[PDB]
Paper text:
The Na+,K+-ATPase generates electrochemical gradients of Na+ and K+ across the plasma membrane via a functional cycle that includes various phosphoenzyme intermediates. The enzyme is a binary complex of a large α-subunit of the P-type ATPase family responsible for ion transport and enzymatic reaction and a β-subunit acting as a chaperone and functional modulator. Furthermore, regulatory FXYD proteins may associate with the complex in a tissue-dependent manner. The ion exchange is driven by ATP hydrolysis via enzyme autophosphorylation and dephosphorylation, and a minimal scheme of the Na+,K+-ATPase cycle, also termed the Post-Albers scheme, includes two major conformations, E1 and E2, in their phosphorylated and nonphosphorylated states.
Here, we describe a 4.0 Å resolution crystal structure and functional properties of the pig kidney Na+,K+-ATPase stabilized by the inhibitor beryllium fluoride (denoted E2–BeFx). BeFx coordinated to the conserved Asp369 phosphorylation site in the conserved DKTG segment of the P domain was identified in unbiased initial Fo–Fc difference map. The TGES loop of the actuator (A) domain is in close proximity to BeFx and protects the phosphorylation site from spontaneous hydrolysis. The structure resembles the E2P form obtained by phosphorylation from inorganic phosphate (Pi) and stabilized by cardiotonic steroids, including a low-affinity Mg2+ site near ion binding site II. The extracellular ion pathway is formed by the transmembrane (TM) αM1–M6 helices, which define an outward-open arrangement similar to SERCA1a in the Mg2+-stabilized E2–BeFx form. The arrangement of αM2–M5 helices in Na+,K+-ATPase, however, is slightly more compact, and the residues lining the pathway have larger hydrophobic side chains (e.g., Tyr308, Phe316, Phe783, and Phe786 in Na+,K+-ATPase corresponding to Phe279, Ile298, Ile775, and Thr778 in SERCA). The extracellular ion pathway is thus narrow but solvated, consistent with a low voltage sensitivity of K+ binding through such a pathway and a voltage-insensitive release of the third and last Na+ ion from the Na+-bound state. For the cation-binding sites in the TM domain, we observed a residual density near site II in the initial unbiased Fo–Fc difference map, similar to a Mg2+ site in the E2P–OBN complex. Indeed, the E2–BeFx crystals were grown in the presence of 175 mM MgCl2, and Mg2+ binding is likely to stabilize an open conformation as seen also for the E2–BeFx complex of SERCA1a, although the site is shifted. The E2–BeFx crystal structure reveals that the cation-binding cavity is open to the extracellular side and occupied by a Mg2+ ion.
Author numbering:
A (entry chain C): 726 to 1016
B (entry chain D): 13 to 303
C (entry chain C): 288 to 384
D (entry chain E): 17 to 48
E (entry chain C): 94 to 141
Write the structure that this text describes.
């Protein structure tokens, strides 16, 4: 209704009020509506992908009885720490095309979270994201003489608080706190690596159809978030006594670049599909993957 | 609500039969590709680690002090009279000492008699396979005094007044440095400053201190320290079946049917401790011999 | 969301006892798997995002009492407006000469 | 001894990078 | 918000079951419930 030229009873009943009485607001209204609707698809996807690498270690931790690759504390720093700032930034993204040109969605045919989104994130991007994490995990352990092949079934004796003669494949003996300090130190890059892959997943999920360059990275919020996210993660590992309060220890530099390729690979994969969606409007690329 | 089994379009689980095959092919090819990448990345990582020396050893800088009888809680409670009560404890002792008999060291080729007194630490070349499979210094069970597992008490071990040994964590390349003559805390139960790393055990608690009046230490050459000559360790692959030096303590007059605490402390220039790891060069134990 | 979660949790709950694990702990996993599967930060993300979009509406004097209503305008397929006041200016006014 | 790391160095190093990083996105977001 | 709540209660319930069985179990699942619930409360406050 119109705020200054409308019946009071009607205004209360209405779900939206126009103060200026400019009927034009409707136009902007649907514009935003169809716009925000999409950007949410984008936003939801970013957080969802994160869960596949979030959960994955716990799973193998039981399957192969290995030391726990990822701490629950860090997960919180992803779902509710770093990831949030980029997630908010996604909304600011401008429209890929002039949405006003398209028909109304159909509430039956088209849905917010389609089956495609799942396959795209849980099935592919997240799975690649997780693989990068395990790589780092295996790398750190080996670099201190705990060989991947040798890590199988090691959980049982590992988590015991009294066995201080654990034998690594190199042959040394380790006390409980040390090898734990390592497990915690190992947890920290998993978190770090997660941000590294969540870089790519952020960019690719900025656009549904057009290429990355085509859209352009003019979204200031997105940019600030990447730096903010990176800074937080870095600080999280290098502040005094984080290994004491949150059981998260510093990181040896070579660790940071552990999964830079894995994320890059992610970026390459999505972009090429976006091009494939563009070149051909054929269903297989579209129906299977066009969330 | 759950009738997606079939449809007029012949959808199975709401999906066409041919396309199923198409999705199956995509996933299989994609998953294989990811694993193929992941494994190949791991192969790289294998080649970034030497086979003789670990790349990072900073974590184990403080050595550790394990116990032969690994109690669920470092607590020993049993009946002197009852064999069954201490049977399980005895078994652990048996397995550890099994690879220490004179018969076990049958091949003179791989065994060097270091000597019957402490002597100079035996540096054995640079850690490379340019030399051959290096040599191990022997260690007779006879060296253990009145705590010999297979001698005076071949199966008995200790029915009362139990023996307990400590062990140094086997560590690649550690050059122990015995403490200087003048240490204020140092209680000189022995004058062997030049070639021994002393370990002394005290109740720590005043109540416990009073509870145990005296303890008997047994060492090679009657010396209560690790022999400097045996070290340094050269790695399992380089030195298969290497034998860690062993030091034993048998408690004397004891308080029966009471719980007491004993703190075993290693000393020397190159040893640290932490108020968060009760085993990092330090040592605690709870012991109760109830009749 | 939950539908996949239960399937994963149930499947793991199967493979849990398939391996040497006791019912006592197998449940703990099923709970945990379903739990960690649940999105957490998303709630505040979506809500914050929605409020932000409304702000710019409020910047242009488009207000909504119900916050979840901003999306509805974009997601519409048919409209019905009142000629008087809404469309007209409701003023007798000089038209043609 | 090879069993010691100058952690404090890279520790401080990381701190510096993060601090610098914050001001950069800050500068970006407060573009004028 | 309700869905998150069910998870939280589930986390809280889980810790109790865990505590009874094991000895000195880690306070991880418990910690999870507190933050999860707190998120909703903060979310609700902002919304209101
Ligand atoms: C890696 C990122 C590559 C993305 C990219 O090219 O981004 C598009 C970008 O460029 C614009 O888009 C045009 C589209 O044709 C280009 O022709 C440009 O000449 C320019 O008008 O817009 C952003 C803001 O400056 C971003 O930083 C980049 O500068
Ligand atoms: C397009 C993509 C898939 C090409 C893949 C290249 C990969 C296999 C290469 C390129 C850069 C390499 C990484 C560079 C840096 C390091 C740090 C080192 O301490 C561990 C190995 C590691 C992590 C390397 C692993 C192998 C590596 C990841
Ligand atoms: C622009 C972006 C995408 C490029 C990649 C980010 C790189 C340059 C940043 C991100 C995090 C950074 C690391 C954070 C912490 C440290 C500790 C410091 O004592 C040594 C450098 C090191 C290891 C930094 C190296 C540079 C680094 C890896
Ligand atoms: C030793 O254990 O046994 C001897 C009996 O054969 C005994 O005389 C001797 O005092 C004991 N010594 C110690 C240190 O226990
Ligand atoms: C090998 C040996 O016993 N050396 C000691 C020396 O440690 C001590 O400082 C000195 C007392 O003045 O007496 C010497 O006999
Ligand atoms: Mg999560
Ligand atoms: Mg009207």
């Amino acid at each position: 209704a119109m705020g200054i030229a409308g019946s009071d009873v009607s205004k209360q009943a209405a779900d939206m009020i126009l103060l200026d009485d400019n009927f034009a607001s409707i136009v902007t209204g649907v514009e935003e509506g169809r716009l925000i609707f999409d950007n949410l698809k984008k936003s939801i996807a970013y957080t969802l992908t994160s869960n596949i690498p979030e959960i994955t270690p716990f799973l193998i931790f039981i399957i192969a009885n290995i030391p726990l690759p990822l701490g629950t504390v860090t997960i919180l720093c992803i779902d509710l720490g770093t990831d949030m700032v980029p997630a908010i930034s996604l909304a600011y993204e401008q429209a890929e095309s002039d949405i006003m040109k398209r028909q109304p969605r159909n509430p039956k045919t088209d849905k917010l979270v389609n089956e495609q989104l799942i396959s795209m994130a849980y099935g592919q991007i997240g799975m690649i994201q997780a693989l990068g994490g395990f790589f780092t995990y295996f790398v750190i352990l080996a670099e201190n003489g705990f060989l991947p092949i040798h890590l199988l079934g090691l959980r049982v004796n590992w988590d015991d608080r009294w066995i201080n003669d654990v034998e690594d494949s190199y042959g040394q003996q380790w006390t409980y706190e040390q090898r734990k300090i390592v497990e915690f130190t190992c947890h920290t890059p998993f978190f770090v690596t997660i941000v590294v892959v969540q870089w790519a997943d952020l960019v690719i999920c900025k656009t549904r159809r057009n290429s990355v360059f085509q859209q352009g990275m003019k979204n200031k919020i997105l940019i600030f978030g990447l730096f903010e996210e990176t800074a937080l993660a870095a600080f999280l590992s290098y502040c005094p006594g984080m290994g004491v309060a949150l059981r998260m220890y510093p990181l040896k530099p070579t660790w940071w670049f552990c999964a830079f390729p894995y994320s890059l690979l992610i970026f390459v994969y999505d972009e090429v599909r976006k091009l494939i969606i563009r070149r051909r409007p054929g269903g297989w690329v579209e129906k299977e993957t066009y969330y | 609500k759950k009738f997606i089994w079939n449809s007029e379009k012949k959808e199975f689980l709401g999906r066409t039969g041919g396309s199923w095959f198409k999705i199956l092919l995509f996933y299989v090819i994609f998953y294989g590709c990811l694993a193929g990448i992941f494994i190949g990345t791991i192969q790289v990582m294998l080649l970034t680690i030497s086979e003789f020396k670990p790349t990072y050893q900073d974590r184990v800088a403080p050595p550790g002090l394990t116990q032969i009888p690994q109690s669920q809680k470092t607590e020993i409670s049993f009946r002197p009279n009852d064999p069954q009560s201490y049977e399980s404890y005895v078994v652990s002792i048996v397995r550890f000492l099994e690879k220490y008999k004179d018969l076990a060291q049958k091949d003179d080729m791989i065994f060097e008699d270091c000597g019957n007194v402490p002597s100079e630490l035996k540096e054995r070349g640079e850690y490379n396979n340019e030399r051959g499979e290096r040599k191990v210094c022997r260690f007779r069970l006879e060296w253990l005094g009145n705590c010999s597992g297979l001698n005076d008490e071949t199966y008995g071990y200790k029915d009362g007044k139990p023996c307990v040994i400590i062990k140094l964590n086997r560590v690649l390349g550690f050059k122990p440095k015995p403490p200087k003559n003048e240490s204020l805390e140092t209680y000189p139960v022995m004058k062997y400053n030049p070639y021994v790393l002393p370990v002394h055990c005290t109740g720590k608690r005043d109540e416990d201190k009073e509870k145990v009046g005296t303890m008997e230490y047994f060492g090679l050459g009657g010396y209560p320290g690790f022999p400097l000559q045996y070290y340094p360790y050269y790695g399992k692959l380089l030195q298969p079946k290497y034998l860690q030096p062993l030091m034993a303590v048998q408690f004397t007059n004891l308080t029966m049917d009471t719980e007491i605490r004993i703190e075993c402390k290693a000393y020397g220039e190159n040893i640290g401790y932490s108020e968060k790891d009760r085993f990092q060069g330090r040592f605690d134990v709870k012991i109760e011999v109830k009749s | 969301i939950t539908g996949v979660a239960v399937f994963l949790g149930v499947s793991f709950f199967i493979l849990s006892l398939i391996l040497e694990y006791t019912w006592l702990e197998a449940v703990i996993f099923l709970i945990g798997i379903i739990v960690a599967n649940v999105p957490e930060g998303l709630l505040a993300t979506v809500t914050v995002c929605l409020t932000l979009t409304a702000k710019r509406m409020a910047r242009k004097n488009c207000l909504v009492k119900n916050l979840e209503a901003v999306e509805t305008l974009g997601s519409t397929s048919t409209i019905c407006s009142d000629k008087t006041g809404t469309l007209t200016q409701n003023r007798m006014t000089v038209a043609h000469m | 001894d090879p069993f010691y790391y100058d952690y404090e160095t890279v520790r401080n190093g990381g701190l510096i990078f993060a601090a610098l990083a914050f001001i950069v996105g800050l500068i970006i977001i407060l573009s004028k | 918000s309700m869905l998150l709540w069910i998870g939280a209660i589930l986390c809280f319930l889980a810790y109790g079951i865990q505590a009874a069985t094991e000895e000195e179990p880690q306070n991880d699942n418990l910690y999870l419930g507190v933050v999860l619930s707190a998120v909703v409360i903060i979310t609700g406050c902002f919304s209101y």
